[PDB]
Amino acid sequence: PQGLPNNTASWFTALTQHGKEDLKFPRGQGVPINTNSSPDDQIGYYRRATRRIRGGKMKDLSPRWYFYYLGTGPEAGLPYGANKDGIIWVATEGALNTPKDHIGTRNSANNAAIVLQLPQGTTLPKGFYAE
């Protein structure tokens, strides 16, 4: 079996925002589970992406937050903690403040995104689901 391609460069599926609350995590939480990574790699950001369709004006759909490792993706040039709307920062204890060159971005045409999982007990804002 093969699913439809996800043309985003994030290595993980998005966290869909079903309510009015933006995505945010308490300090030390939010980094997606990746068994092929070390404690040093557990740092990055989520970026809000929005699909837009016409209805007759151009309305938007439920916002989706995609995780990118530190120093990679659409905000590769932003240092950790940099303020920008739609960008929220996450880091597990013990992570290094260095760009994750070795992990990088996903090639959407040949690699499937990993289902975003978070450790049990992770606090999520209202309208978000770990599923």
Numbering used by the authors: 42 to 96, 99 to 174
Per the authors:
One central protein involved in the formation of regulatory ribonucleoprotein complexes (RNP) is the coronaviral structural protein nucleocapsid (N).
All crystal structures of nat_mutants with WT-like RNA-binding (nat_mutants P67S, A119S, E136D and P151S) superimpose well with the NTD WT with RMSD values between 0.592 and 1.776 Å. Mutated residues in the above-named nat_mutants lie peripheral to the structural core, which further supports both the converging structures and the unaltered apparent RNA-binding affinities. In the context of N itself, these mutations may also have direct consequences for immune evasion of the virus and could e.g., alter epitopes detected by circulating antibodies. A recent study suggests P151 is part of such an epitope. As our structure shows the NTD fold is unaltered in the P151S mutant, this suggests a respective virus variant may benefit from lowered detection by the immune system, and the same could be true for other loop-located mutations.
